Amino acid sequence: MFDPAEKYKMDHRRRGIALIFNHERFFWHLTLPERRGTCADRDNLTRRFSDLGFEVKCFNDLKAEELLLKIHEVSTVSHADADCFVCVFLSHGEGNHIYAYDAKIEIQTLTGLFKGDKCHSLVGKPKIFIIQAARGNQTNITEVDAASVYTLPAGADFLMCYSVAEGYYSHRETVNGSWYIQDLCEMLGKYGSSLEFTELLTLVNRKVSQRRVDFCKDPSAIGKKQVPCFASMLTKKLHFFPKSNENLYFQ
């Protein structure tokens, strides 16, 4: 019965939830810079994921306790009537940690909450994480952070998506937002509803790698390329085809 073109089942009543944890400022005693532009990212993401049928829930500058609570909440709610789950971090990070407002959180513990064992409603459905996180270096300027967050995998049917890989650099325009998120969102706009999601993420890798970094306003920001990646542990093709909502309840 084995099928090389098998797709994830994306015919549930609702598409599912897209969390967006958005971090602009941090507690003084962490000594991390403002991520001026992260709001463009949040809004651009919010729009593109909405037009794909996600209930988008944004959360600005949560402390560790608040963040762990809101994400544990979402893991224990039923996704039984949902196609998939998306979770997005716009912050600083280091190694296997993302930064909340007040301290770092182990990424494995956030993905761990949606592992088949602990969230039955999502077993066999895609769990996509998107992570725009790097090291805080210290009108519209382009700021550049060094890659810092390990490009971890997660578990069966997870897709981990990363702004930048080891040895490369992450770019954020202070008005237009992160290079990764701009190009992710451009591709979501044009191709989200037709293309297989990893096919799309590959276009994002081209779009971002192709961005030139030879003629730069800061002389020290020259020759710092951005190459994003993704770690697929998906088992099927993933498409976000428009859902039929013609005389149906999808709330």
Binding residues (CB under 6 A) for ligand XMR: these are 147-153, 166
205 binds a copy of itself (CB under 8 A): yes
User: Out of 74, 148, 231, 243, which residue is the one contacting a copy of itself (CB under 8 A)?
Assistant: 231
Plot region of 202 (φ>0 → left; ψ -120 to 50 → alpha; else → beta): alpha
How far apart CA 13 and CA 248 sit, in angstroms, is 8
Report the partner that residue 148 touches, choosing among a copy of itself, ligand XMR, none (CB closer than 5 to 8 A by kind).
Answer: ligand XMR
- Find the binding residues for a copy of itself in span 148-187 (CB under 8 A): 150-156, 162, 165-167
CB-wise, 141 or 146, nearer to ligand XMR? 146
CB-wise, 45 or 154, nearer to a copy of itself? 154
Query: Coil, strand, or helix at residue 163?
Result: coil
6 binds a copy of itself (CB under 8 A): yes
Report the partner that residue 236 touches, choosing among a copy of itself, ligand XMR, none (CB closer than 5 to 8 A by kind).
Answer: a copy of itself
Plot region of 120 (φ>0 → left; ψ -120 to 50 → alpha; else → beta): alpha
Amino acid identity at 135: R
Q: Token digits for 70?
A: 């809101």
Residues followed by a break in the chain (C to N exceeding 2.5 Å) are 138
User: Out of 57, 63, 190, 211, which residue is the one contacting a copy of itself (CB under 8 A)?
Assistant: 190
59 binds a copy of itself (CB under 8 A): no
Closest to 133 (Cα-Cα) out of 122, 124, 145: 145
- Applying CB under 8 A, which part among 10-18, 41-49, 134-142, 196-204 lies near a copy of itself? 196-204
Plot region of 207 (φ>0 → left; ψ -120 to 50 → alpha; else → beta): alpha
Size of the chain in residues:
251
How far apart CA 84 and CA 72 sit, in angstroms, is 16
135 binds a copy of itself (CB under 8 A): no
Measured in degrees and rounded to the nearest 5, phi and psi for residue 70 equal: -65, -30
230 binds a copy of itself (CB under 8 A): yes
CB-wise, 148 or 198, nearer to ligand XMR? 148
- Find the binding residues for a copy of itself in span 72-111 (CB under 8 A): 108
- What is the contact surface with a copy of itself in residues (CB under 8 A)? 4, 6, 108, 150-156, 162, 165-167, 190-191, 195-196, 198-199, 201-203, 205-206, 209-210, 225, 227-237
